[PDB]
Amino acid sequence: NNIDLAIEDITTVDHSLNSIYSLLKSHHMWGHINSTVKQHLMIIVKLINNNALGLASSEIIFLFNETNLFQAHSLKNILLADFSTWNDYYLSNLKILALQIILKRKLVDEYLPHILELFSHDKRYLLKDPNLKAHALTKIVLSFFSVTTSCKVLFGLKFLQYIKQFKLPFKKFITVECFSKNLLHKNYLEMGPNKIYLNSFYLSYSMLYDGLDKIMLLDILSYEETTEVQRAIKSKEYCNMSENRLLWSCISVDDLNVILENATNFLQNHISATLKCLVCLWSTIRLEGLPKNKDILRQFDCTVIYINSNIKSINDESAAALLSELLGVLSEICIDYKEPKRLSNIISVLFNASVLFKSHSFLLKTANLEISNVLISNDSKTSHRTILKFEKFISSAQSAQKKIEIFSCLFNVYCMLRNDTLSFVFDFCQNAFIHCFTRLKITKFIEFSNSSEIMLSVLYGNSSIENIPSENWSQLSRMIFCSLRGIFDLDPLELNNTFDKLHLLNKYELLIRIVYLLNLDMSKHLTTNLSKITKLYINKWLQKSDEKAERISSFEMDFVKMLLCYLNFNNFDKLSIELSLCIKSKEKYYSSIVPYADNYLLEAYLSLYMIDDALMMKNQLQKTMNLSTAKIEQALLHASSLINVHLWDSDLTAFQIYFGKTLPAMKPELFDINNDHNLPMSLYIKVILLNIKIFNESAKLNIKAGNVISAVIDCRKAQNLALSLLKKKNKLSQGSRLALLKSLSFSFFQLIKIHIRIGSARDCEFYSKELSRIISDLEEPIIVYRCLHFLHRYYMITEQTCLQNITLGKANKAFDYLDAEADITSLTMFLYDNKEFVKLEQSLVLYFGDQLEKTFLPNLWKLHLGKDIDDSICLSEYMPKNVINRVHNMWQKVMSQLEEDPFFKGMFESTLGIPSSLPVIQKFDRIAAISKLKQMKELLESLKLDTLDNHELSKISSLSSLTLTILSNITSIHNAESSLITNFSLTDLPRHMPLLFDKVLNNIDNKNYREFNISTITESIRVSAAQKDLMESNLNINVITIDFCPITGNLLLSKLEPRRKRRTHLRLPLHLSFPEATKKLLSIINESNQTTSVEVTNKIKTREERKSWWTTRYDLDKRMQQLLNNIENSWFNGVQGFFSPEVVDNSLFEKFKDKFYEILHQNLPSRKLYGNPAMFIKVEDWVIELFLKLNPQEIDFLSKMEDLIYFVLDILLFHGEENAYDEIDFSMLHVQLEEQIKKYRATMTTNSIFHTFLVVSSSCHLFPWECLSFLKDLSITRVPSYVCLNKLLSRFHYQLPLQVTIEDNISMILNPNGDLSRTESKFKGMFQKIIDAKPSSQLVMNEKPEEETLLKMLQNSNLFVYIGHGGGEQYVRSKEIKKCTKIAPSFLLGCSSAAMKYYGKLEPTGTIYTYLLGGCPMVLGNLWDVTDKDIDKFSEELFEKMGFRCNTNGNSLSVSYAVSKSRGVCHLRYLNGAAPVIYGLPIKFV
Amino acid sequence: MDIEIAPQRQEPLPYVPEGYSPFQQDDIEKLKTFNSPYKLDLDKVDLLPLEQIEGLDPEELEDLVT
């Protein structure tokens, strides 16, 4: 039951009505308009029944105006309104109500020509409503027929027609047969001026009564009026000019054609006149209302070709108006005839007049006719046509205001055609934006007239106009707006709690809500809601794909692309797979977007190391899509996905062929980084990004394949392209910004990794610093985290333990902003960093669940954790990490097994050597141990060195020589000497490789980095050729390496006696360790260094501060002396003779050997009791020689001898000869060996080697070896490797020393900074003298030298000497010295010239190595800072002993002897005196 | 006793590897800065061509609108 309300004031109702019609229209809720109109229709009839005809009438007009583009301001406008989708469900009944009103107001007489016009064209104005109310309408006709004072016949004819047409019972009135005659009475057939219509009416009447007792036309019209129509017709430009028609109404259907044809010729046979007739003719055609036929249509088509052709022939505005009128009456014909093609031609002619006449009036008329057609055609599939048309109109408009005016005819809500899809309105608005709005060039918000809220939201959402009043709009409209704008101003609390009851957008609420949250997240650089909304979209939108049964919005298309991309950038790879699969599932709707699902599914498989599925993906994609026809966006998409290394199989070749030849041959524009084809900037950016990604992965492939150089070059192209990509004027798009973030961080990771592999601390520091800097200002959490995770690993490798702590804290903080459950690759990285390896390999099972079998990811993590896996289940790619791990695992196992046998445990704590024994030709079993060791020897030999980073090459080398050493002390081995040889050059490789890489990478032409290869193999030959050459040089020298064993902690000595053709090596176990000595020393050095800085010395003013600084340095000096003492007396117990420069007399040696063995025979329990002398283990000669090298006169002679005994006993022990110390006669060993040694010394010849080369490893460089008591009197230079020594010696034909002439072209630099004025005082004298009587010599003093002058100094001097801080880095770059090939012998006599900055497991560097690489053959510097009086004492002495004077000769000293004889002049014998060191060859002045 | 002394520890001329160009402050802003994924970016007037080939009673009034 419903109540009824009396209505006292109708204006209240109207208000409610207009209020509702407005809202419904604005929120696209079209179906509620119907239900509202229904109420409104009831209001109108209730007015009619209560005789409020005046009110009812204007209510009709109100109803119509509120629901149509067209407007009415009389009932006549209602009556002749066309049907459209907007009104066709009521229009029929509205017109009947209007006719009712005209009837009850008794206004039939005044409405008469309109009511006739209406019913004349009833087919168009009325008889379209399929549910037309017959009885009502036809009853309305009879009643009009009744009351009308004219044209009763016309009504009669129509009424009979309807009753037949609708099969109505005549009995709604006496006889029906009589009715016709009554109509026929003279007064009924009286029509007045409206006779014009009669033809139309009768024709419609005829139709239903043809073949019956039809009221014929001759009953109405006399034969006279009908004959002389045709009679005149074919005997004559014959029309009633004053009435815009033909002289005759009811023109014969056939006689039409002769008139029709006549005029056609008349056209062919001034323009003003013709049109006038043309208007007359076609106005009568409408009037008569003949059914269309070819004859009419031929003439039409012709008449409209005539008009069009003569537009320019019009000048007067009289002809202009005539033209508009003719075009108007013709357009009406097209609507009477349903001729859309034909109407569109009339729009064309109007448009052309608008151009030729230069008239906004014609253009406005053109626009509206276009719109009319649209409303009438009602095909929302057509509207692209209109928008493109309106583009041409707008373009043609005469001014800015006029263009905006035309625009509004198109940007109009009735253009929606009651379409209730988001897809259509987005499609319409975006196209109106691209093709039309942008031509308006407006910079302030225009609230376009007669358009919806939704239309305004999508249109201005896409605009860059500043202050849009969006807050006027419903929340959901503002949400679309924000998402479009990248600006988010909606309060969170409010977005959940407001709601509009009636809104089209309520149909899309979930979608709009998740698009908003996605874009909100991205805007704030977070992922807070990423997982929530990806799941929402999959299960409550995407899943209801076929429920919703609707075309997909571009709004949703763009959303999905942005979602896949943000999932991928945050490594939400699980969600990515599920989303992508689901999309490729709902293909019925998402087919256009499936290229994105396919690409992003591929990248997700790869990120989860699901190589299996990735490859299925690869080869399907490749075949299933052709590139020659793919648009550039899809081709970019296809190509980008195929880039990943794991998509190949370490096949740099295939990769290079594909991206370097195949792909450019088929899609060149993929490689148009100069944009010559001028693509849209957005695609051009995407092209550059493609090429960036290609070069980034190409770096990875090259470097995984031992191509360090070209990998470095690739990386640098990638970075240069990125720099050029940022300079492009573009307002970078979110998708491309993220792409570039991923790419740019990658190339830093890659470059740093490449430089870690070759051990270059220098470049790593540079890059890590650049990367760190960038991170800081960034805000994307996944990028910030990943970079901090990387830098942290880097700080671990370089052992910068403070930054290591700081960046672990930062990395852990950064992780908070990540979705731990969604990003498994970030989680495992976090778990690893924090030592939770258990939680790690097991969160990998909770993430893959039952999919664990198709990902290499948990096995990859096994490899990172040191495990080696089953070869059959390891990817070919990660096979080298696998074997490397196996080696180390194999080592820990064998070493730990052996070590629980006291025999091997003791052996590892013993000085060991090789060769120590001459070959023939039981907690742990001896055969088992020889087996496991030979296994280790061969596994080490199997691996490919080019796959190793330098620090691993180092450990593999030491592991290789330790295994050989254990083996040889335990058994006799196959190819004994050759194994020692290959091992000697193996241990030299990691000394050489960093230096060569340094040199090569530095002489790289910089053109290579902007155009869009050594290796361990050739280097292996050079390293072993060096050693072969040295050996054969027959030089009477020692070459002794000093190295440290990372694995064991052992000191490592080797010796190379070219003249003796002998190679020996020994392992010293080590009271302090090598790492403790390194600590104690660094502490001393960094403290003395400190005491040296001008900051400190400057603050020393009083007598007291003076004495403190001196107490401290004398104290630092004693600490260092003590440390070196400890080292002497610990590290070389029993083997200081390995360093001895003495050569044994061969004749004497052999008699000593006889005695030596006799002594062992009579005093060792084994030789006394077991076997015979032919089975005794014989010791190598060089071991025996060590005894002869002892000095019985030394105070600690017996300790040294005792230690030699131990060594020899050990050799016999490990080879199987037991000798209980319990029963060795040590008393007799002691007495008899000392006796024979005294006899030898007392009679020996004094022949010694000439010089000692110390090959000093970077780890051992800091120690002042040359100041050990058994080294301090020797002629020594240092060298960094065998390869450097042998090339230096090859450079000077193996002639020691290096004769260097001093008679001219000598360079000097003195106090280049005026901070050493006493030094200047001391040397001012001699230096300025040498520039005098010694040509082409240069001196720079108290004057900063400029880079080019000392570069020429270096490469153009017989001698270079420099006094001041360091080695002149502050005046010339490392780079240019390194480019040189020949440098002068340099005296770098300054603070810390030979010092080196150390970086954990990477190679250090310093001025010293750079000179060597510049081709300097002798460079002399200090290992730490030195103080001026003492060092200048040393320098003065150095010059004098070497002969550096102005009177150039005699028997001067070599740089070597000259240095060791000059140390003593320093007051602080260690802090200052131990500081100088020489690298290269010894020189003497001549 | 009079002290000894050391040259000022100056700065080594900066090392810059492999023709590296640093990323400018501008470049960094372009990397930090969110722009909507939805933003998009995209002469003589020529004439258009022509194609070729007492009435109803109170109850009757209410029936009509219903």
What single DSSP character describes residue A551? P
- Give the burial class of A325: count Cβ atoms within 10 A of its Cβ; 0-12 exposed, 13-18 middle, 19 or more buried: middle
From A1366, A998, A763, select the one nearest B16 (Cα to Cα): A763
Q: Is the dihedral of CA A245, A251, A256, A258 positive or negative?
A: negative
Q: Is A1364 within 8 Å of B7 when comparing Cβ atoms? A: yes
The phi-psi region of residue A1193 (left if phi > 0; otherwise alpha if psi is between -120 and 50; otherwise beta) is alpha
Pairwise CB contact (< 8 Å): B18 & A341 = no
Q: Do A1371 and B39 touch (CB under 8 A)?
A: no
The dihedral through the CA atoms of A897, A903, A909, A913 has a sign that is negative
Q: Does any CB of chain A come closer than 8 Å to the CB of residue B41?
A: yes
Contact A462 B60 (CB under 8 A): no
Burial category of A276 from C-beta neighbours within 10 Å (exposed 0-12, middle 13-18, buried 19 and up): middle
DSSP-derived secondary structure letter, B14: P
Distance from C-alpha of A671 to C-alpha of A690, rounded to nearest angstrom? 8
A776-790 in b/e form (b: 16+ CB < 10 A) is: eebbbbbbbbbbbbb
Q: What is the DSSP string of A119-137?
A: HHTHHHHTTT-TT--HHHH
Is residue B44 less than 8 Å (CB to CB) from chain A?
A: no
Structure tokens at A538: 């999959």
Q: In sequence order, what DSSP letters do the residues of A918-956 get, joined into one string?
A: ------S-HHHHHHHHHHHHHHHHHS-GGG--HHHHHHH
- Which chain A residues are closer than 8 Å to B64 by Cβ? 45, 93, 96-97, 133, 136
Element (H, E) at A1247: strand A1247-1248
Report CB contact under 8 Å: A140, B34: no
What DSSP designation does A651 have? -
Tokens 């006709």 — which residue? A141
What span, in angstroms and rounded, lies between the C-alpha atoms of A756 and A773?
Answer: 20
Closest CA to A1296 of A1465, A1456, A1069, A1171: A1456
Contact B45, A395 (CB under 8 A): yes
CA distance A996 to A993: 5
Cα–Cα distances in angstroms (integers) from residue A1445 to residues A1011, A1299, A1304, A1389, in the given order: 53, 16, 12, 17
∠ CA A439-A445-A449, nearest 5°, is 85
Best to test chain B binding among A518, A524, A1370, A1392 (most B CBs inside 10 Å): A1370
For residues A204 and A288, the answer to whether their CB atoms sit within 8 Å is no
CA of B8 vs chain A CAs: smallest distance (Å): 6
Report the half-sphere exposure of A1025 (CA within 13 A, side-chain side). 8
CB proximity list for A240: less than 8 A, separation 6 or greater: A246, A247, A280
Chain B's closest residue to A1002, CA to CA, is: B18
What's the CA gap between A52 and B10, in Å, rounded? 104
Q: Strand A1251-1256 relative to strand A1037-1044: parallel, antiparallel, unpaired?
A: parallel
If we measure between CA atoms, which residue out of A968, A980, A959, A978 comes closest to residue A916? A968
A1415 phi-psi bin (left φ>0, alpha ψ -120 to 50, beta other): left
Q: What is the signed CA dihedral for A84, A85, A90, A96, rounded to 10 degrees?
A: 10
Instruction: Tell which residue, A997, A1000, A1004, has the closest CA to residue A953.
Output: A997
Among the partner-chain residues B27, B32, B65, the one whose CB lies closest to the CB of A42 is B65
Sequence-ordered alpha helix ranges (H) in A707-758: 708-727, 734-757
Across the interface, of A143, A1004, A1313, the residue whose CB is closest to B8 is A1313
Using alpha carbons, list the distances in angstroms from residue A1349 to A271, A1327, A1331, A1342. Answer: 93, 18, 16, 15
Question: In A1364-1481, which ranges are E strands?
Answer: 1386-1388, 1418-1422, 1476-1480
Task: State how far the alpha carbon of A343 is from the alpha carbons of A321, A332, A338, A647, in Å.
Answer: 19, 9, 9, 59
CA pair distance A360, A687, nearest whole angstrom: 45
- What is the distance between the terminal CA atoms of chain A, rounded to a whole angstrom? 130
CA distances from A1294 to A180, A1032, A1041 (A): 140, 11, 20
Q: Distance between CA atoms of A753 and A1440, rounded to whole angstroms?
A: 50
Strand-by-strand arrangement of the A1306-1310 sheet = A912-914, A1062-1068, A1051-1057, A1037-1044, A1251-1256, A1276-1279, A1476-1480, A1418-1422, A1386-1388, A1359-1363, A1306-1310, A1338-1341
Torsional class of B18: left (φ above 0), alpha (ψ -120 to 50), beta (otherwise):
left
Asked if the Cβ–Cβ distance from A1097 to B61 is below 8 Å, we say no
At residue A309, what is the residue type?
A: S
Measured distance CA(A431)–CA(A455) in Å, rounded: 12
- CB under 8 Å, gap of 24 or more: what pairs does A627-632 form? A627/A663, A627/A666, A627/A667, A628/A666, A628/A667, A630/A667, A632/A667, A632/A669, A632/A670, A632/A679, A632/A683, A632/A687
Distances (CA, A) of A1212 to A398, A968, A1150: 112, 12, 21
Interface test with A, best of B41, B64, B66 (most A CBs within 10 A): B64
Residues from chain A that touch B39, judged by Cβ atoms under 8 A, are 462, 464, 486, 731, 733
What's the rounded Cα separation, in Å, for the pair A821 and A148?
A: 85
Backbone angles phi, psi at A1310, to 5 degrees: -135, 115
Whole-angstrom CA distances from A636 to A619, A695, A794 are 17, 15, 34
Q: Which residues lie closer than 8 Å to A1102 by C-beta, 6 or more apart?
A: none
User: Which one-letter amino acid corresponds to residue A1140?
Assistant: S
Residue of A1417, A1442, A1478, A1458 whose CA lies nearest to A1292: A1417
Query: Of the candidates B1, B19, B53, which has its C-beta nearest A1106's C-beta?
Result: B1
Residues of B in contact with A48 (CB under 8 A): 61
Chain interruptions in chain B, by residue before each (C–N > 2.5 Å): 42, 53
Question: Which CA distances in Å does A472 have to A24, A476, A481, A483, A1193?
Answer: 16, 12, 12, 17, 107
At residue A869, φ and ψ (nearest 5 deg) are -110, 175
Chains A and B form CB pairs within 8 A to the count of: 240
Going by C-alpha positions, the residue among A549, A565, A546 that lies closest to residue A557 is: A565
- Residue A1300, strand partner residues: A1485
Residue A484's closest CA among A467, A462, A505, A465? A462
Question: Which residues, in sequence order, are CB contacts of A1438 under 8 Å at separation 6+?
Answer: A1387, A1444, A1458, A1459, A1462
Residue A624 corresponds to which amino acid?
T
Phi, psi of A1358 (to 5 degrees): -75, -25
> Does B59 lie at the interface with A, CB-CB under 8 angstroms?
no
Q: Give the separation between CA A758 and CA A703, rounded to whole angstroms.
A: 11
Structure token digits, residue A1481: 């060859």
Mutation site for A-interface testing, chosen from B25, B32, B34, B43 by largest number of A Cβ within 10 Å: B34
A1366/B10 touch (CB, cutoff 8 Å), yes or no: yes
Of the candidates A517, A614, A598, the residue with the CA atom closest to the CA atom of residue A564: A598
> How many other C-beta atoms lie within 10 A of the C-beta of residue A851?
13
The contacts of residue A638 (CB under 8 Å, 6+ apart) are: A595, A599, A621, A625, A627, A630
Amino acid at A95: K
Answer for the pair A764, A755: CB distance below 8 angstroms, yes or no: yes
Interchain CB contact of A483 with B (< 8 Å): yes
Task: Name chain B contacts of A344, Cβ cutoff 8 Å.
Answer: 51
CB neighbour list of residue A307: distance below 8 Å, 6 or more residues apart: A275, A278, A323, A326, A327, A349
Searching chain A, which residue's CA lies closest to the CA of residue B18? A1006
Cα separation values, A577 from A488, A558, A585, A645, A825, Å = 29, 18, 12, 20, 15
Say if CB A32 and CB A502 are below 8 A apart.
yes
Distance CA A475, CA A1425 (A): 73
Question: Do residues A1466 and A1431 lie in contact, with contact meaning Cβ atoms separated by under 8 Å?
Answer: yes
Q: CA angle, corner A868, sides to A866 and A874, nearest 5?
A: 125
Q: What is the β-pairing status of strands A1338-1341 and A1359-1363? A: unpaired
Domain spans in chain A, listed from the N-terminal domain onward: 241-377, 878-1065, 1085-1248, 1276-1485
Please say whether the beta carbons of A1431 and A1092 come within 8 A.
no
How does DSSP classify residue A213? Answer: S
Resolution in Å, one decimal, please: 2.6
Query: Does the beta-carbon distance from B64 to A136 stay under 8 Å?
Result: yes
Tell me if residue A286 falls in helix, strand or coil.
helix
The CA distance from B49 to the nearest CA of chain A, in Å, is 7
Mapped onto helix, strand or coil, the DSSP state of residue A1055 is strand
Helical packing angle, A734-757 and A761-777, nearest 10°: 160
| Longest distance between any two alpha carbons in chain B, whole Å | 137
CATH architecture of the domain with range A1276-1485: 3-Layer(aba) Sandwich (3.40)
Residue A323 Cα distances to A314, A326, A817, A1281, angstroms: 9, 5, 72, 101
Q: For residue B63, which residues of chain A lie inside 8 Å, CB to CB?
A: 133, 136
Q: Which of B7, B23, B60 sits opposite A1313 (nearest CB)?
A: B7
All residues of chain B having their beta carbon less than 8 Å from the beta carbon of residue A96 are: 56, 64
**What is the C-alpha R_g of chain A?**
52
CA distance A111 to chain B (A): 16
Q: Touching check for B57 and chain A: CB below 8 Å?
A: no
Does B37 sit within 8 Å of A93, measured CB to CB? no
Nearest CA distance, A783 vs chain B (angstrom): 11
The type of residue at A621 is L
User: What end-to-end distance do the CA atoms of chain B give, in Å?
Assistant: 122
Complete DSSP assignment for A63-89: HHHTT-SS--SSHHHHHTPPP-TTTTT
- Ramachandran angles phi, psi of A317, nearest 5°: -90, 0
Exposure letters A186-196 (e unless 16+ CB within 10 A, then b): eebbebeebbb
**What string of DSSP letters covers A1301-1344?**
--SS-EEEEE-TTS--HHHHHHHHHHHHHHTTSSTT-EEEESSP
Residues in chain B: 66
Beta-sheet pairing, A1386-1388 with A1359-1363: parallel
Mind telling me how many Å the CA of A1003 is from chain B's nearest CA? 10
Where do we find the tokens 């090339």? A1287
Q: Does A305 touch chain B (CB under 8 A)?
A: yes
Q: Measure the CA–CA gap between A770 and A751, rounded to whole angstroms.
A: 12
Chain B interface includes A923 (CB < 8 A) = no
The torsion angle over the Cα atoms of residues A1374, A1378, A1383 and A1386, rounded to 10 degrees, is 30
Q: Provide the CB-side half-sphere exposure for A251 (13 A, CA).
A: 26
* A396/B contact by beta carbon, under 8 A: yes
List chain A residues with CB under 8 Å of B9: 1093-1094, 1365, 1391
Helices (H), A131-194: 134-147, 152-165, 176-184
Tokens in use for A391? 């583009």
- CB contact B20 to A (< 8 Å): yes
Nearest-Å Rg of the Cα atoms of chain B is 42
Nearest-neighbour CA in chain A from B65: distance (Å): 6
DSSP A797-827: HTT-HHHHHHHHHHHHHHHTTS-TTT-HHHH
Q: At what angle do helices A708-727 and A989-1002 cross, to 10 degrees?
A: 40
Positive or negative: CA dihedral A474, A478, A479, A484: positive
The closest of A922, A914, A991, A984 to A950, measured between CA atoms, is A991
- Is A1119 touching B (CB cutoff 8 A)? no
Residues A893 and A885: their CA atoms lie apart, in Å, by 12
Cα gap A792→A685, rounded to integer Å: 32
The residues pairing with A1338 across neighbouring beta strands, listed in sequence order, are: A1307
DSSP state of A629: S
Of A727, A734, A1313, the CB nearest to B37: A734
Residue A759: phi and psi, rounded to 5, are 75, 10
Residue A1486 tokens read as 């001549």
Q: What are phi and psi of A1190, to 5 degrees?
A: -65, 150
Residues A764, B66 contacting (CB under 8 angstroms): no
The rounded distance, in Å, linking the Cα atoms of A1177 and A1173 is: 9
A1096 touches B: beta carbon within 8 Å: no
Rounded CA separation A976/A918 (Å): 10
**Where in the sequence numbering do the catalytic residues of A fall?**
1391
Q: Select the residue from B16, B21, B25, B31 to test the A interface by mutation, using most A Cβ atoms within 10 A.
A: B31
Nearest to A1254 by CA among A1417, A1042, A1460: A1042
* CA-to-CA separations, A111 to A157, A160, A193, A744, A1408, in angstroms, rounded: 19, 22, 14, 79, 113
Q: Give which of A1142, A1144, A1138, A1251 is closest to A1200, Cα–Cα.
A: A1138
For chain A, say whether B45 makes contact (Cβ under 8 Å). Answer: yes
